[PDB]
């Protein structure tokens, strides 16, 4: 086994075709399925696996009630081949309430986070053994990606926040070579917040499309130079914008460098990925609520401010339904590195308060240089059927 | 790993001996089993696996109700070793409501179909990565085999329809070398319809025994020349005939070249496989309803029109019971390539409307050059026991 | 991989120490466990697996009722590593209502039997493919071992009956080299019946301790000469005797050559295995009912008629409980070939008619050249707890 | 595969970071989970597995009632990768009511104990085959570690008691090279009792931190010389002390050589592990009841009597909750051998007599040379939710 160095062109995609759905909630009505959220999928040179954080229980468990809350001791990081539901036979690869995973080529690094909010811990596991540990630095919740990290040559990047969701924060980018952090590099850029970065291998570095829970609703970019550790974090030129809540589609703006301050409040985990001066991206159809999922390409959107030349749309999930988080997902072709992407479809309380638990399914789409039809793939489960 | 080139004689079989049953419905009363239909089994140089399309749920799920319908977003392609039931621990290898799978020798290609009926998409997955995509072409349901495709030397064939079930249609035969379609070839032949082809490796090409939902009740043949892409599609000389509904057994006819127009309406997925001028084939015992399964050899039936010299019958499934689809299943011997075949036994609504869900079990029989006894293997599950 | 030729001394054992129990019935009250009976365990050069025939269902299935009957279409041959219960995730390796399995070294041969009683079929599977088939020969139930077959050099033996349980019968010994029967050899010996042979590798041939459902209650021996195909079947010299029902322990007799005619009626699957002029054997404590299990060594018992010098007893299962079938189980040491043995503990109807289903657990003991304590390991499950 | 010889420095740890929790009880409310207790985890050069002894059943089984009792025929030794719950798909690797497991490098040795209390047996399994057996020697319960044994060069140590819990006893240290005991060595030392030793590879020998159910509440040390078989068993210099029940924290004492006689009665399985003249150890927060878990380092505590210079505490499990047993768990780093440790959290009768069954979850922590936060990880399951 030599290393995963990614030297190879990205694919000139033409849109996305469907790859995987698991029906996690549906089956949850007839089987014992874990309680999840904040999923993501990543793969080694052979199989694509699917992760997510549980709630130390199952859905048809009287326990599950109040799964709305993101952190609790009993939450663990699951793993399965891409395609199997999360069952009583799944493994809790580590304790955590946040994470990131990359396959450096040789084996896995699994950053998993847990502790008190104000003082928590981050175990850096690798190849099964626990290679390192680094604790919270601001004293107000150490959180990470909830997406696949990226490694190149033998060094795995991973961005980390601990600060004030809607406020300033310390963003560091740890460079851990084999479960062992070997160098940390402090954030720099126009980016007024970095959180839930969706990172990918666009050689020689790593580029990140994050979230901004404070003033921006136009994703902040985070570019890592795996070559010298230096950082750079701009903002997206695309005038379209994909974050929720967000202004609209006409008064929606972005100048590639400053929080736009338009419902710049919260956010959601999102992705995007360049191609020349263009921009393949995705977001919720609803711009108030996290419902419906569409994906598209903005001409000029990566190199040019306030763009609006949308083209090649797709209604991945219908706007009458509901989605949630999503992240990019790379996966090296036999000549080019193709990007893929996932979408958790969250069914549960706060919204569908018919039941008291919260969990989620997933749908995933990859890159294609061929045709496709049209459609939308939701969780599609009868909340009047589901237990509780 | 060199390639699967099939250069090796087919076996001079003498009838079929039992191989596998899974009891899918029976266990479904005491366990959490997926909701299926349109199964098939295929194997790599080591294990035989069993496929089928689910209904994004399980049987003891209040959801399952109305599984009669063939397409919906939440239907996925399962896979398991030959012998295990479809459980909560099975994987959804792709989203689809149609498919085909072959092992080119090195790894798997998994055509899976999904989208709106009128406009749908076909993901061409291979080795886990998504190599290509080609969308619907007539705008009225892109459908494929629901049986194992066949590869030789490194090129995998797969026939595709999109048109009018009971009407004309476009039938194309895609030649995808490694998840990448590299050449499409348009249908040609006496065949007035091609749909649900049951294809196999009868070197140097590939030969297909399809269905005809319009005017024929005598299977149309579809011969592929993997050598130059050319096509040829005749009809079966056998005067016996195996399709349901169908005329009878005396006024049942076929001339090897034109729809016979005798209850030539619908059909069901069927198989057949030559041997000299003869014909080993199978069909439902009931010629109105898809009930009971028998298999036999018609002397003269492959090279001679309107044949009736039946011999070596078997009551695979009793005519008091019920079957459904079926397809051929090859599996290379240590000197000859033996054919095997499967039979879904569909238990569910429209018929057994005691319950509201529809799923199916399976029985499978291989080729033998030795003796056998007699019997019939049905789903045999108490519909008064089953849930719902 | 060279072949399993067994050239290596058997171990001078000193008694049996406990190896495996699975608690099949107990868990059956809190989980979905298959309905079984007629088990046995066998191993390849790495793992020991556990077999048995199911009843196409699970225990907490309303179907299971009337599992007392041995044959029905929906019965299949399971397989799992030695230690896991038979779950909804177990595989039906073949259809059958009888069987035998050996690992010739390279891979598995799985004789499985099914068909009408009067006319049935026997599929000879191997390495996943179906290599051969041979049908019933007397027209009254083709049955086999229900124990591990034995292979040496590359030829696998397997004894087969079809005749009259309590009457004469045809006993043949098929020699199948790679799923392909290559020579059948007709039974010869003092043995007035051969049925449920418990066979083992006592180089250069294979020796069998069977059952006799007609006139004997003293196990008939069946010695195979894998060298020239010739057969020889004596009877056990041991005057102790181990079969149920059986006379007693004082008027119990055997002369090494003729059915003794003492409650010589039915039987049960049993084992035994020589050592010099002695005899390590096992049987039920109850000599009317199949309850309790003990094992011991009779000095002189293999080379001398009507023996009674019992020594080294063990109460494997207490006589207040209940057992059933049992068979020998070899397993090559790092210098000597050690024998092991299993014991199904049948819980169910006809006896414990509190419930209407019948299934069974298992306990297994191997050979030891070291000390041991005392005890008894029953199914030990509350029939008042169990479902139905 | 060469052998596991451990020549390599232990790691200068700085405290413990979280690795694994499984939520065994929580899921037990929504799934079929085995009934356990007396767990432990151990690993081969690749995966870390988790063991424990069951109670031949599952929790939602009416059987489980009265799982308070430690021994019964139907108790078996489970095994799974580190992270999966104990499910109906787990294997019973042997019958036992006590055990120990080490990976000599090449494969596993699994001492499992069962029999009458007064006369029991100990099967010494290895690589799947049963290599040896040695029976009880005092006639009053042969018990072993309930923790991972340690092998070096090719010889696996394992300490064994059989005597009087609160009285004298015979303590032997068997040296079994490949499932075959090749030399037994009798205990020697100041140690007035050895029971439930928590052993580890501190090259060239093996050192053990046991329990004392008679007069001590200050762990007895047990040092093995794998070099010449000689033994040595002192007591811990640490004046802090970690055993429950125990005096307090001020009148708590130890002189490194004699039972201190302060609530020196019972105990619990514990661990500890040196580092220079210091001592990293752990115990229950409650000194009467086995509740809460903390871990720390006592300066001077390994080489100096009655120590009280505690530092680097952690509240692993909060004192408002409840723990149970615990043991050390080694795991070779890429330059140093890191120690890890587990903690069963027992939920069940005698205490939480709301229900009638007893089982347990687990939390596990490894060694780190990096920072960490703070927190506590309990079973945290609603006893008012749980079944029974
Ligand atoms: C490939 O396949 C697409 C699939 O797109 C999606 O369709 C759903 C909505 O139809 C969406 O939720 C789902 O998840 C799919 O992802 C092909 O067509 C698609 O469907 C139609 C047009 O073809 C577009 O959707 C619209 O949605 C409305 C809700 O269904 C529908 O009622 C709209 O209908 C109005 O125009 C149609 C035109 O055919 C016609 O039916 C009527 O005239 C109708 O008029 C309305 O007017 C009044 C006010 O609204 C009402 O009082 C009156 O009752 C009536 O509702 C409309 O059809 C969807 O966007 C479209 N997709 C795309 C990409 O165009 C598409 O043909 C093909 N394209 C490509 C590149 O392959
Ligand atoms: C190997 O094993 C076969 C197994 O074949 C199948 O048998 C079932 C039907 O019997 C079928 O559903 C099942 O699934 C099996 O696959 C051996 O025999 C088989 O069974 C019989 C003859 O041997 C054939 O089946 C017929 O089915 C009727 C329903 O059971 C049965 O009642 C018929 O019986 C009439 O003739 C028999 C001859 O033995 C005799 O019983 C009576 O005289 C009976 O007369 C009827 O007459 C009146 C009008 O019908 C009634 O008023 C009166 O009450 C009575 O019903 C018949 O036996 C089945 O086809 C046959 N299989 C084959 C291949 O022949 C077979 O012996 C052997 N062959 C080979 C090559 O190995
Ligand atoms: C290793 O370990 C053995 C284990 O053997 C088995 O014991 C159970 C029966 O006790 C059996 O079902 C279980 O499954 C075990 O496999 C050691 O001992 C074993 O137990 C005893 C003797 O040691 C033997 O079993 C007998 O079973 C009767 C039912 O329990 C029991 O009541 C008998 O007791 C009579 O004698 C004992 C002697 O100690 C004493 O208790 C009394 O005096 C009692 O007297 C009876 O007399 C009247 C009529 O019966 C009654 O009115 C009165 O109430 C009372 O019942 C007896 O103890 C069992 O066979 C034995 N096993 C072996 C191999 O000896 C054994 O010590 C040791 N051996 C070796 C080689 O390692
Ligand atoms: C990293 O993270 C630690 C986590 O430690 C643990 O905290 C829980 C207890 O708080 C424990 O069960 C849990 O499992 C954790 O493992 C950081 O702090 C930790 O929490 C606090 C202090 O920081 C310590 O715990 C104490 O526990 C009491 C129960 O919660 C709590 O009420 C105590 O509060 C008293 O002092 C605090 C100081 O901040 C303040 O809140 C009040 O003044 C309060 O006063 C009480 O006084 C009267 C009598 O008690 C009452 O009438 C009145 O109502 C009120 O209760 C206290 O805070 C815990 O030990 C501590 N851990 C450590 C290691 O210090 C820690 O800051 C950081 N350290 C490091 C190295 O990283
Ligand atoms: C990184 O990319 C590839 C794959 O890791 C490296 O491997 C060699 O690269 C090219 C073609 O890929 C040739 O020089 C060798 O034949 C490759 N070997 C294999 C097994 O692919 C490549 O050298 C690395 N290069 C950079 C610039 O990072
Ligand atoms: C990672 O991969 C290759 C590893 O070799 C790095 O490029 C190499 O450049 C040196 C001189 O710097 C050559 O001698 C190497 O052998 C080059 N690669 C090849 C295939 O020749 C590359 O620049 C590194 N990139 C990153 C992002 O870390
Ligand atoms: C295709 O069939 C076989 C198997 O793929 C090819 O392999 C060689 O073929 C024959 C015997 O099978 C000999 O020439 C070689 O010894 C074979 N090698 C092996 C490993 O079997 C064969 O050459 C191919 N031929 C055609 C005509 O397609
Ligand atoms: C059968 O037994 C063994 C094992 O199959 C054969 O293997 C050779 O036998 C001996 C020692 O076992 C030596 O001649 C070789 O070194 C063995 N090789 C191995 C890999 O064990 C043996 O020759 C066979 N002999 C008979 C008489 O059947
Ligand atoms: C099975 O195994 C060995 C295979 O070699 C057989 O014994 C051999 O005897 C021949 C001459 O007959 C020698 O040249 C072989 O090489 C011998 N074995 C060895 C290791 O030398 C053996 O007799 C056969 N036994 C059975 C029961 O089939
Ligand atoms: C035990 O430790 C190591 C690992 O088992 C042995 O292996 C050799 O040891 C050193 C470095 O580890 C060198 O002499 C060799 O290069 C090692 N080989 C490998 C594959 O690591 C070591 O010799 C053994 N030594 C002792 C003292 O027990
Ligand atoms: C276990 O491991 C090594 C095995 O070699 C033992 O040390 C060896 O010492 C001899 C002379 O005694 C050398 O020739 C060996 O080759 C040494 N090891 C190495 C790598 O050179 C060691 O002392 C043994 N220790 C224990 C606890 O059993
Ligand atoms: Ca925002
Ligand atoms: Ca038709
Ligand atoms: Ca008899
Ligand atoms: Ca004590």
């Amino acid at each position: 086994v030599e290393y995963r160095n990614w030297s190879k062109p990205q694919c000139q995609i033409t849109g996305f075709a469907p790859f995987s759905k698991d029906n996690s909630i549906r089956l949850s009505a007839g089987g014992d399925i874990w309680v999840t959220r904040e999923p993501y999928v990543s793969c080694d040179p052979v199989k694509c696996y699917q992760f997510a954080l549980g709630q130390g229980t199952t859905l048809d468990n009287k326990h599950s009630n109040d799964t709305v809350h993101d952190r609790i001791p009993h939450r663990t990081l699951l793993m399965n081949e891409l395609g199997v539901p999360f069952h009583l036979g799944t493994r809790q690869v580590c304790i955590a309430w946040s994470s990131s995973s990359c396959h450096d080529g040789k084996a896995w690094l699994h950053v998993c986070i847990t502790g008190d909010d104000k003082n928590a811990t981050a175990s850096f596991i690798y190849d099964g053994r626990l290679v390192d540990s680094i604790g919270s630095w601001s004293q107000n919740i150490l959180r990470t990606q909830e997406s696949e990290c990226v490694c190149i040559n033998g060094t795995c990047t991973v961005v980390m926040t601990d600060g004030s969701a809607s406020g300033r924060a310390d963003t560091r980018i740890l460079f851990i070579e084999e479960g062992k952090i070997v160098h940390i590099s402090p954030l720099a850029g126009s980016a007024q917040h970095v959180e839930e970065c969706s990172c990918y291998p666009r050689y020689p570095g790593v580029r990140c499309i994050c979230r901004d829970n404070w003033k921006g609703s136009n994703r902040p970019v985070v570019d890592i130079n795996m070559e010298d550790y230096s950082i750079d974090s701009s903002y997206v030129c695309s005038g379209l914008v994909g974050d929720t809540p967000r202004n609209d589609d006409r008064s929606s703006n972005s100048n590639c460098r400053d929080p736009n301050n338009e419902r710049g409040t919260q956010g959601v985990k999102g992705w995007a990925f360049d191609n020349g001066n263009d921009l393949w991206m995705g977001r919720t159809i609803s711009k108030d609520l996290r419902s419906g999922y569409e994906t598209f390409k903005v001409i000029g959107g990566w190199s040019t401010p306030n763009s609006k030349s949308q083209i090649n749309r797709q209604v991945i999930v219908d706007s009458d339904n509901r989605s949630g988080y999503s992240g990019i997902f790379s996966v090296e072709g036999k000549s080019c590195i193709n990007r893929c992407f996932y979408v958790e479809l969250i069914r549960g309380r706060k919204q569908e308060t018919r039941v008291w638990w919260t969990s989620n399914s997933i749908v995933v789409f990859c890159g294609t240089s061929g045709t496709y039809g049209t459609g939308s793939w939701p969780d599609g489960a009868n909340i009047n059927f589901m237990p509780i």
Side-chain angles (χ1 to χ4, degrees), chain A:
Chain A
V1 196
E2 7 89 30
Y3 283 101
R4 249 181 159 146
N5 61 10
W6 300 105
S7 279
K8 165 193 266 90
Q10 184 195 245
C11 317
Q12 281 299 128
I13 91 165
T14 66
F16 308 96
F19 204 55
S20 320
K21 186 172 181 309
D22 65 0
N23 307 83
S24 300
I25 284 312
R26 271 167 95 77
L27 306 191
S28 300
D32 311 326
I33 307 312
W34 272 89
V35 170
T36 53
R37 258 221 66 227
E38 305 126 34
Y40 60 101
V41 2
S42 169
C43 340
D44 46 53
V46 302
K47 223 101 46 166
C48 275
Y49 304 79
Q50 64 183 267
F51 306 67
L53 313 156
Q55 264 297 36
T57 181
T58 288
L59 197 135
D60 215 309
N61 252 105
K62 289 193 317 159
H63 284 220
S64 68
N65 191 357
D66 291 349
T67 288
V68 279
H69 318 273
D70 305 78
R71 297 159 298 246
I72 67 160
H74 336 310
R75 282 186 48 119
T76 27
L77 186 70
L78 311 190
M79 204 177 153
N80 260 159
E81 299 206 321
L82 186 54
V84 332
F86 282 159
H87 52 122
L88 257 190
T90 316
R91 94 229 184 58
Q92 284 139 308
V93 66
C94 58
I95 301 187
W97 40 234
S98 181
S99 56
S100 173
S101 324
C102 23
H103 196 115
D104 71 291
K106 320 311 197 56
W108 308 69
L109 187 202
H110 293 298
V111 30
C112 322
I113 304 186
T114 299
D116 305 286
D117 300 89
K118 270 177 289 196
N119 195 14
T121 167
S123 301
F124 269 65
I125 310 154
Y126 177 80
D127 201 44
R129 35 238 54 171
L130 181 155
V131 194
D132 214 346
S133 283
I134 193 182
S136 53
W137 54 66
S138 292
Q139 285 55 243
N140 185 80
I141 316 172
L142 187 37
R143 348 116 138 116
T144 188
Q145 311 185 18
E146 320 298 36
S147 194
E148 76 158 307
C149 38
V150 39
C151 310
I152 286 178
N153 272 353
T155 309
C156 298
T157 331
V158 72
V159 317
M160 328 209 151
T161 313
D162 180 4
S164 37
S166 317
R168 160 136 63 237
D170 214 340
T171 289
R172 271 175 242 180
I173 337 271
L174 334 187
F175 296 58
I176 166 197
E177 312 188 0
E178 284 161 23
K180 179 57 68 163
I181 342 178
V182 321
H183 186 334
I184 301 183
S185 284
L187 190 64
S190 310
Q192 277 249 252
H193 217 57
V194 160
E195 246 208 64
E196 304 197 327
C197 291
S198 290
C199 304
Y200 54 74
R202 53 111 66 234
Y203 203 86
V206 161
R207 177 207 294 298
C208 310
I209 296 277
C210 327
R211 154 198 220 197
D212 179 308
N213 293 76
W214 179 32
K215 289 194 316 304
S217 60
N218 57 313
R219 315 247 160 217
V221 159
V222 168
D223 218 289
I224 298 101
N225 169 344
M226 303 283 287
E227 329 138 17
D228 84 3
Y229 298 105
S230 62
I231 317 309
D232 194 358
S233 74
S234 59
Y235 262 90
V236 207
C237 275
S238 175
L240 243 166
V241 170
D243 191 304
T244 301
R246 71 183 168 307
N247 220 4
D248 178 330
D249 224 44
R250 296 313 299 105
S251 44
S252 168
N253 310 81
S254 193
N255 67 317
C256 331
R257 64 170 256 46
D258 310 280
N260 67 37
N261 307 45
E262 323 183 280
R263 258 133 83 74
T265 42
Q266 344 91 276
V268 58
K269 173 172 174 70
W271 64 276
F273 90 84
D274 81 81
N275 199 247
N277 297 295
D278 319 322
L279 171 72
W280 282 103
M281 58 153 264
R283 34 156 213 192
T284 34
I285 282 179
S286 173
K287 53 143 210 67
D288 266 286
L289 287 170
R290 298 193 193 158
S291 310
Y293 199 100
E294 66 181 350
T295 43
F296 58 84
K297 156 184 162 157
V298 184
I299 314 172
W302 169 259
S303 66
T304 81
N306 231 174
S307 315
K308 315 266 180 133
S309 295
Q310 126 73 7
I311 186 186
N312 295 153
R313 148 148 192 185
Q314 294 198 217
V315 84
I316 300 285
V317 200
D318 64 80
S319 60
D320 267 78
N321 281 337
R322 48 189 308 221
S323 50
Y325 273 22
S326 92
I328 166 74
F329 151 7
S330 300
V331 47
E332 164 166 32
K334 197 185 178 287
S335 51
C336 63
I337 138 70
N338 164 219
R339 324 237 90 83
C340 296
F341 78 94
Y342 81 93
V343 184
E344 78 162 81
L345 330 160
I346 186 267
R347 303 288 314 210
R349 200 88 172 192
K350 229 95 255 52
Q351 185 112 323
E352 308 193 287
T353 62
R354 214 287 276 179
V355 311
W356 294 78
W357 49 267
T358 289
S359 193
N360 64 291
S361 175
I362 82 187
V363 191
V364 306
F365 274 63
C366 276
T368 159
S369 55
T371 318
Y372 45 69
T374 303
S376 97
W377 297 253
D379 182 82
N382 205 258
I383 197 70
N384 304 117
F385 286 175
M386 309 304 301
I388 293 269

